[PDB]
Amino acid sequence: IDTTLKYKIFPEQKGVSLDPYATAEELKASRRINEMREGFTVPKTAIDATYIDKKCPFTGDVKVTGKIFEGVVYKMKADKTIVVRINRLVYNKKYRRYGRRHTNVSTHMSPCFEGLIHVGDTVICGETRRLSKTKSSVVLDFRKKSTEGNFKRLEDF
Amino acid sequence: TGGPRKHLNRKVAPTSWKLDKSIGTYAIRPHSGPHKKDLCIPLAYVLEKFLEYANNRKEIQIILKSKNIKINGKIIEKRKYPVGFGDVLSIIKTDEHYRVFYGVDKNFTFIKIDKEEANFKLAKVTNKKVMYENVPYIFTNDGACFKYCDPAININDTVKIDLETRLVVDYVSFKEGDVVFVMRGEDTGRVGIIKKIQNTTVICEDLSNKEFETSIDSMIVIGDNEESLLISLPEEKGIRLTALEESNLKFGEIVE
Amino acid sequence: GINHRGEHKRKKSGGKSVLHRKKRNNRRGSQMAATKVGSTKVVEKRARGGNKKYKALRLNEGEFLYKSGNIINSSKIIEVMYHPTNNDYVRTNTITKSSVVKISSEGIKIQDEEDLKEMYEKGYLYAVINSRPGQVGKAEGEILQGSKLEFYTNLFKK
RNA sequence: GUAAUACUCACUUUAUUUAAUGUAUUAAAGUAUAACUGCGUUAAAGUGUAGCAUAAGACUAUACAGUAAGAGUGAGACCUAUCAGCUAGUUGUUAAGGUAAUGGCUUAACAAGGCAAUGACGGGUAACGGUAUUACUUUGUAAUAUUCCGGAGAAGGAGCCU
Ligand SMILES: [Mg+2]
Ligand SMILES: [Mg+2]
Ligand SMILES: [Mg+2]
Ligand SMILES: [Mg+2]
Numbered sequence: 001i002d003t004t005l006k007y008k009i010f011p012e013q014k015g016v017s018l019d020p021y022a023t024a025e026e027l028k029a030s031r032r033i034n035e036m037r038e039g040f041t042v043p044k045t046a047i048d049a050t051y052i053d054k055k056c057p058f059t060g061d062v063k064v065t066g067k068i069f070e071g072v073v074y075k076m077k078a079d080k081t082i083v084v085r086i087n088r089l090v091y092n093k094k095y096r097r098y099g100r101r102h103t104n105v106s107t108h109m110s111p112c113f114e115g116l117i118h119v120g121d122t123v124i125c126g127e128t129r130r131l132s133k134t135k136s137s138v139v140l141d142f143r144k145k146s147t148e149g150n151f152k153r154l155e156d157f
Numbered sequence: 158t159g160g161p162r163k164h165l166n167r168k169v170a171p172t173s174w175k176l177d178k179s180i181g182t183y184a185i186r187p188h189s190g191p192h193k194k195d196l197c198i199p200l201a202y203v204l205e206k207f208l209e210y211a212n213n214r215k216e217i218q219i220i221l222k223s224k225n226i227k228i229n230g231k232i233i234e235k236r237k238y239p240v241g242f243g244d245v246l247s248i249i250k251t252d253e254h255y256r257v258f259y260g261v262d263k264n265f266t267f268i269k270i271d272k273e274e275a276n277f278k279l280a281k282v283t284n285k286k287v288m289y290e291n292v293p294y295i296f297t298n299d300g301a302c303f304k305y306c307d308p309a310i311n312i313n314d315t316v317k318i319d320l321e322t323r324l325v326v327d328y329v330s331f332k333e334g335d336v337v338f339v340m341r342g343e344d345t346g347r348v349g350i351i352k353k354i355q356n357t358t359v360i361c362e363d364l365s366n367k368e369f370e371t372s373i374d375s376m377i378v379i380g381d382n383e384e385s386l387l388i389s390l391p392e393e394k395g396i397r398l399t400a401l402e403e404s405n406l407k408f409g410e411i412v413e
Numbered sequence: 414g415i416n417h418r419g420e421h422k423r424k425k426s427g428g429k430s431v432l433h434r435k436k437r438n439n440r441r442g443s444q445m446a447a448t449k450v451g452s453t454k455v456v457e458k459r460a461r462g463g464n465k466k467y468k469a470l471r472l473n474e475g476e477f478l479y480k481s482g483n484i485i486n487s488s489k490i491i492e493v494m495y496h497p498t499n500n501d502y503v504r505t506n507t508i509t510k511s512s513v514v515k516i517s518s519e520g521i522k523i524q525d526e527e528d529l530k531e532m533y534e535k536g537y538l539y540a541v542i543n544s545r546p547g548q549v550g551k552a553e554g555e556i557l558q559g560s561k562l563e564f565y566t567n568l569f570k571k
Numbered sequence: 572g573u574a575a576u577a578c579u580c581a582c583u584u585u586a587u588u589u590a591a592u593g594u595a596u597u598a599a600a601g602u603a604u605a606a607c608u609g610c611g612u613u614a615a616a617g618u619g620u621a622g623c624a625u626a627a628g629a630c631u632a633u634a635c636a637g638u639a640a641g642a643g644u645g646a647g648a649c650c651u652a653u654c655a656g657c658u659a660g661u662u663g664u665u666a667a668g669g670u671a672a673u674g675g676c677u678u679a680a681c682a683a684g685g686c687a688a689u690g691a692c693g694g695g696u697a698a699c700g701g702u703a704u705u706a707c708u709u710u711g712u713a714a715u716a717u718u719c720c721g722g723a724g725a726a727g728g729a730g731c732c733u
Binding site: 005006007008009054063065066067069075077078079080081083088090093094096099100101102103104105106127128129130131132133134135136137 | 581582583584585586642643644645646647662663664665666673674675676680682683684685686689710711712
């Protein structure tokens with residue numbers, strides 16, 4: 001029905017059944033939206049859109065259980081995958097100083113956020129069950145890159 | 158290790174069994190039952206160590222096969238039967254009855270009670286839903302199912318089992334300002350008055366006006382009010398004085 | 414025979430891996446059972462801790478549901494029209510999950526719609542399977558109606 | 572044997588199986604082979620043909636607790652630059668098969684991804700990991716086959732029945 005995602009099977013959702021001869025608005029009011037944890041809202045693009053994804057947590061099957069982490073994006077080249085860089089500090093007991101370590105975690109990107117998220121801004125994720133060989137978490141919310149000091153003209157004031 | 162384990166070791170035995178870590182090597186691994194792994198004890202240790210009725214393995218079979226031992230109103234002849242928390246065991250001869258709960262120093266005790274208390278039993282609800290053909294059900298801690306009860310009993314309230322007709326008789330609801338009993342955690346055997354109920358813990362008050370916080374799963378309310386006192390209390394009443402006052406009673410208090 | 418372990422694959426960085434233990438019985442597999450069309454045949458399986466499974470080697474007279482009138486009736490299975498992942502199954506006539514077929518319209522009592530009328534003059538109608546044949550042991554599905562018929566018929570052989 | 576997938580700690584399993592235990596729900600005439608009796612066989616080890624031969628047996632289903640086990644995520648851990656580039660089921664998307672179950676775990680089609688001086692990829696070990704417990708100490712080091720918990724193997728490799 002929508003050609004944003006190329007299909008090899010009929011794009012319907014699980015458990016949501018209706019009469020076959022159905023209008024566009026009758027199809028639109030029957031999309032099931034999942035429930036979330038506290039502190040998180042479903043986005044505006046999760047409701048008005050028409051896509052069907054198996055792995056997106058809004059209008060999907062995967063339930064998020066467990067901890068919640070954070071990071072900075074590193075790459076956005078492939079499809080529905082982004083690489084989140086996590087920084088932390090370890091403590092050495094002999095020299096009594098700190099070191100810097102880093103990890104890379106590939107996480108699943110929902111089709112709701114399309115033109116918003118760029119390179120170099122924070123993402124709040126959540127851990128789920130396993131989804132691939134290397135994919136285990138899901139993007140939930142984002143914030144823009146901070147603008148502390150930049151050239152501001154008089155119209156920027 | 159392709160299957161289950163059947164041998165237990167004396168060094169990893171629970172310390173609340175009051176066993177000696179001397180000459181023995183193995184200990185009795187008890188059967189699966191209604192209680193958990195922590196609140197259960199084997200029966201053969203009760204007739205040997207805590208109660209003193211037998212000396213060796215032969216005299217254990219004599220009392221058990223004579224069918225006088227009555228746990229929760231049922232005769233039992235297996236030495237591996239687990240005696241849990243809160244159950245009442247009795248002998249048919251000599252009219253001796255006991256209630257089983259912890260002492261003050263995280264050890265098992267046995268307290269002689271009366272025949273008016275020998276009838277009933279207390280337990281705590283954990284879960285409730287409606288089963289097949291529109292019949293309500295209430296599930297307790299030990300795994301008994303009960304139907305057609307009062308609708309005022311909620312998920313966390315306690316019940317009173319008659320133990321002979323197996324019918325729910327009385328219940329005590331869950332609220333603040335109730336007397337409480339604890340059975341797990343780092344603090345066991347404390348008896349307290351509820352002050353503040355949080356979503357996961359409870360803020361309580363001892364009889365010595367102290368304070369402690371404890372998760373909701375580890376407690377059981379025994380009475381709604383101080384004047385209720387549905388069961389009989391232990392002799393110490395679970396006060397568990399600190400090491401400071403234990404250092405104060407030995408040498409006197411510090412004069413200032 | 415066929416394992417489902419993960420200890421043999423390469424790392425995330427691309428370096429080789431090394432094993433330290435033999436093959437376990439916990440992760441144990443089987444071969445593919447391709448369900449054909451013919452005279453009916455069902456064999457039984459034994460799974461872990463009882464729990465018998467049924468596999469079907471040759472299947473016939475699958476059950477289907479009419480969506481508009483909401484009744485269920487049996488029909489025969491004639492041909493396969495489309496299979497999503499591998500296009501060679503249509504020449505060997507194997508039935509798996511989500512593969513559309515061609516069924517007889519004898520016992521079916523249809524309503525009067527514009528699209529189904531021309532095929533209802535002949536004996537044939539269309540249906541799509543929705544159950545795992547090799548593990549449940551029997552096929553069930555839905556009859557194509559409406560815009561769902563508009564989607565699959567662009568993918569036909571023509 | 573394994574430098575980490577093994578081990579320790581903190582989390583998840585609505586993604587899963589469990590004989591013996593506890594409390595509950597449900598259902599309820601016909602058909603073989605042994606031991607026995609009797610004829611035998613081969614150096615040994617074992618095995619055969621009869622007596623329509625003849626006994627006991629075999630032809631309910633599920634819940635919720637309770638024990639036991641499987642599967643995931645993250646963090647920690649020896650020496651080496653006279654080892655600086657490495658990887659092609661390798662990284663991802665769709666679909667199916669298979670398992671008690673998540674998952675390139677396996678297979679079709681398409682795409683070009685994935686990791687690195689915060690040390691990738693290689694080489695060595697006279698390398699089973701923690702722990703109870705010993706020493707020496709001014710923010711902590713060193714030993715720990717030895718008590719206990721956990722993992723792997725039965726001359727070397729592979730395959731399978733109950
Ligand atoms: Mg015979
Ligand atoms: Mg391929
Ligand atoms: Mg060691
Ligand atoms: Mg040898």
